[PDB]
């Protein structure tokens, strides 16, 4: 639906606005799937899995690398 950097631009937009500039804190990704992939937050999980299973090193930030498990669910 859209290519690698433009997803890559998204995320830019959505993990500057607070903390790390260059992650995602929870509110962060909220924001971001409320806004572009709502679908994304109706399914199964909620956004505290969500959260909890993209951020791999538990440092509560998902780096554009963490992000990445979620582009199948995106493209497909
Ligand atoms: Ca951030
Ligand atoms: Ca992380």
């Given at each position: 639906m859209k290519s690698p950097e433009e997803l890559k631009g998204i995320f830019e937009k959505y993990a500057?606005?607070?903390?790390?500039?260059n992650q995602l804190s929870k509110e962060e990704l909220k924001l971001l799937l409320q806004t572009e992939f709502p679908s994304l937050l109706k399914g199964p999980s909620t956004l505290d899995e969500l959260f909890e299973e993209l951020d791999?090193?538990?440092?509560?930030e998902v780096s554009f690398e963490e992000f990445q498990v979620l582009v199948k669910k995106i493209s497909q």
């Open positions: 500057a606005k607070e903390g790390d500039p791999k090193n538990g440092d509560g």
